[PDB]
Design an enzyme around this catalytic site. Sequence first.
Site, PDB file in Angstrom:
ATOM      1  N   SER A   1     -21.534 -35.114 -15.068  1.00  0.00           N
ATOM      2  CA  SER A   1     -22.411 -34.396 -14.150  1.00  0.00           C
ATOM      3  C   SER A   1     -23.860 -34.758 -14.428  1.00  0.00           C
ATOM      4  O   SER A   1     -24.224 -35.941 -14.403  1.00  0.00           O
ATOM      5  CB  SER A   1     -22.157 -32.886 -14.265  1.00  0.00           C
ATOM      6  OG  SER A   1     -22.539 -32.191 -13.083  1.00  0.00           O
TER       7      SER A   1
ATOM      8  N   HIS B   1     -15.380 -31.119  -8.559  1.00  0.00           N
ATOM      9  CA  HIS B   1     -16.360 -31.223  -9.634  1.00  0.00           C
ATOM     10  C   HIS B   1     -15.964 -30.348 -10.815  1.00  0.00           C
ATOM     11  O   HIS B   1     -15.417 -29.253 -10.648  1.00  0.00           O
ATOM     12  CB  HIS B   1     -17.731 -30.807  -9.112  1.00  0.00           C
ATOM     13  CG  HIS B   1     -18.868 -31.241  -9.975  1.00  0.00           C
ATOM     14  ND1 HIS B   1     -19.458 -32.485  -9.866  1.00  0.00           N
ATOM     15  CD2 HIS B   1     -19.555 -30.581 -10.940  1.00  0.00           C
ATOM     16  CE1 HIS B   1     -20.457 -32.569 -10.724  1.00  0.00           C
ATOM     17  NE2 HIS B   1     -20.535 -31.432 -11.390  1.00  0.00           N
TER      18      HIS B   1
ATOM     19  N   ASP C   1     -15.912 -33.178  -4.004  1.00  0.00           N
ATOM     20  CA  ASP C   1     -17.176 -33.014  -4.712  1.00  0.00           C
ATOM     21  C   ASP C   1     -18.266 -33.597  -3.821  1.00  0.00           C
ATOM     22  O   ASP C   1     -18.166 -34.765  -3.428  1.00  0.00           O
ATOM     23  CB  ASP C   1     -17.125 -33.752  -6.061  1.00  0.00           C
ATOM     24  CG  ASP C   1     -18.382 -33.572  -6.912  1.00  0.00           C
ATOM     25  OD1 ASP C   1     -19.415 -33.061  -6.438  1.00  0.00           O
ATOM     26  OD2 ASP C   1     -18.324 -33.980  -8.092  1.00  0.00           O
TER      27      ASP C   1
END
Lengths: 291, 291
Positions: free
Chosen positions: B140, B261, B231
């Site tokens: 991320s 995600h 995502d």
Amino acid sequence: MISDPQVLGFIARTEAAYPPEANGASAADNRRFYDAMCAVFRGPRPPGLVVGDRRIGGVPCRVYGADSAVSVVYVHGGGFVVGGLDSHDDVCAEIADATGLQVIAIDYRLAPEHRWPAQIQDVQAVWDALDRPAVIAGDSAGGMLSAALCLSRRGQRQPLGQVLIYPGLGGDGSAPSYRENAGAPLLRTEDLATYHAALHGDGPVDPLALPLQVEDLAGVAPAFVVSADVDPLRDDARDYVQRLRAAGVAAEWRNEPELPHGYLRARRESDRARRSFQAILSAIMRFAVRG
Amino acid sequence: MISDPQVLGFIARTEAAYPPEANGASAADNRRFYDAMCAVFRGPRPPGLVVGDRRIGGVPCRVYGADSAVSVVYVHGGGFVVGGLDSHDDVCAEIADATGLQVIAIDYRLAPEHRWPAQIQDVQAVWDALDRPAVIAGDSAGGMLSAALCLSRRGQRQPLGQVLIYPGLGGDGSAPSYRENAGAPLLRTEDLATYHAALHGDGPVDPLALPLQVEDLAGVAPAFVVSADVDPLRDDARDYVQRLRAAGVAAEWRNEPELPHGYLRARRESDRARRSFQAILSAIMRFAVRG
């Protein structure tokens, strides 16, 4: 005693998954019980992974993934009597998915109907038809076969590495694990005899069927050998790594605390087993790249 | 839309683990809530693994495993606002356990109290202090920082590889995934700007902070970029790999069907997420061994 509750849960699920029925239970029935037991734990195939069934060197195989510069040959376990392409399908598919390497699983002839050396001849037949760089890998009996393949293939078509997953390697039974883990869950030392008797009968034992008793191990492929700690076969892995290193072969022993024989099937429910398979995949990748 | 029941159960558990109620929640509270959600899914450490906390380059770090010839530097995610060493402990420990590479995780200064470039300064400080062959990896926001580290360190101190796990990389928000996955579970396009606002506040937009907008990507470390299909950031991964390869950098893009995600936290309960982490660990091993 095993104390990890996830592993205790896996053990209970395995035992429920396999009825004791040890009477008039032919090798054919044991084949159906093993396949049913494996199916309890078997994971799904990756959706996009190409899978083909075909003969290679005349032996039925399953090929996972697109052709790659380096391959992985996977030899399934089952005490030389049970197992096949479907029982280990998810293990082989996950190796292919994780590494991007094409995986070739081998449906070798099973004992007792086909005694040694039928099994190693089938692995050799597939290996020799590959004619390509490859890592070899196998669990239990398939680890023995992988080690015996390496012992027979020390020339130019040497495996890039051998990844042996709780293998039986024909130790003489004097090592501590055989008594320490004689009553281990899922595999008792006493169970090993039934598969010995089906494999060879009572004639002579081909020394190649006992990799740990082979006098000279020099020149075989580098090895990553992982043992279940709570398994009568544990110290075959320890001993084989010791002998390989003594013979100049790069070899690593990984021992798995709290895990029994057969724990590949626990990787979907046990952190220890999941981490073990993660290390097995890294070792396969390592050997594949170093070639 | 996700239809895998394991993933739907992970999403439902995550949402229950994290009661929304924002409205004046302080960044310090969001940190408490993120850690508490992570703890629901956090796996255990490998019991034999040596782990120590130490300041490296002046930044609190955690070191997993014994010294190795090649290391892994891990940069946690959390939108530059939450996360730390404890939230991602199991991921880093499992990397060290599976690969046998020493893993160094970085607790960089967080936004909004520290704005860019504080975070990359901290990653750069650990990277320079370590002064060693290493793969860099991150999820991320940690993926953006790992990509920015590579862009800033292209001499002989370049990482051996960059492993970017559902990264945000500074796409303009016009790629399909931002609309297609605008209502995705766990991460929605609407939440994305809040993290950018926290990272830069009033400041200049440094090109380093938008790897996807950097004109010249030539000479950065080869990449393994894995996106979650469900995502809004998915296509940042597709776009970065496209630009990397056009710039002469080897790069692999793996997209994960049916995963949202944050799915690293689902690897203990989702076959899809488990296989993804298995591929991430192989990619790390692959870069370490090539290097």
